Amino acid sequence: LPPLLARVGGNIEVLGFNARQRKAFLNAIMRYGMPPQDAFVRDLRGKSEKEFKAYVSLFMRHLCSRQHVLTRIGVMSLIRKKVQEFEHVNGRWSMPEFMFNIADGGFTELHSLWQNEERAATVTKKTYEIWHRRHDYWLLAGIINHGYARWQDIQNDPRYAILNEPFKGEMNRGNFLEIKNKFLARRFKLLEQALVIEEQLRRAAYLNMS
């Protein structure tokens, strides 16, 4: 109901939103992506649902850092599709107290990585201590529950303790929290690619026919 463009108290408000709300919004979009139609907001605490969608749809038109926001919003949607695809069979706890695949068609090293990694996880039976396909699901699951590139919030969550298990050897190293963060970032960057490639493969399979 507020005006798209207005001047109140010495500042410009876009649909009732001040810069503080306007900046906060973007920060929460880069971190979580777009809420799917509806979903659970700090500076925007007082904002209502009525005003919320007013901004989103108005933000949408704007989109079509312009590309930056576009890709981050899309990527986070790709991750949400994948996690939801297998959420049921895997549960919500990595190490309690399984199924996962990404169809990149062999265009990223992932499938070759997964093969070698899963060989050792099975022959040694050390499932949680050898990073493999299983760990990438829970890495992706964390990126949704906790946000984009939130390695520390993900690590501290018991739900994703599997991500910590392959690195118990270097707990005494001063840089410990870094080595982990550098592995997760280098890993998620690959997953990001495979996720995007799988989408381009699904979309081209339709030959541009809905």
Numbering used by the authors: 1400 to 1439, 1445 to 1468, 1488 to 1520, 1696 to 1808
Q: What does the publication say?
A:
CHD4 is an essential, widely conserved ATP-dependent translocase that is also a broad tumour dependency. In common with other SF2-family chromatin remodelling enzymes, it alters chromatin accessibility by repositioning histone octamers. Besides the helicase and adjacent tandem chromodomains and PHD domains, CHD4 features 1000 residues of N- and C-terminal sequence with unknown structure and function. Auto-inhibition is relieved by a previously unrecognized C-terminal SANT-SLIDE domain split by ~150 residues of disordered sequence, most likely by binding of this domain to substrate DNA.
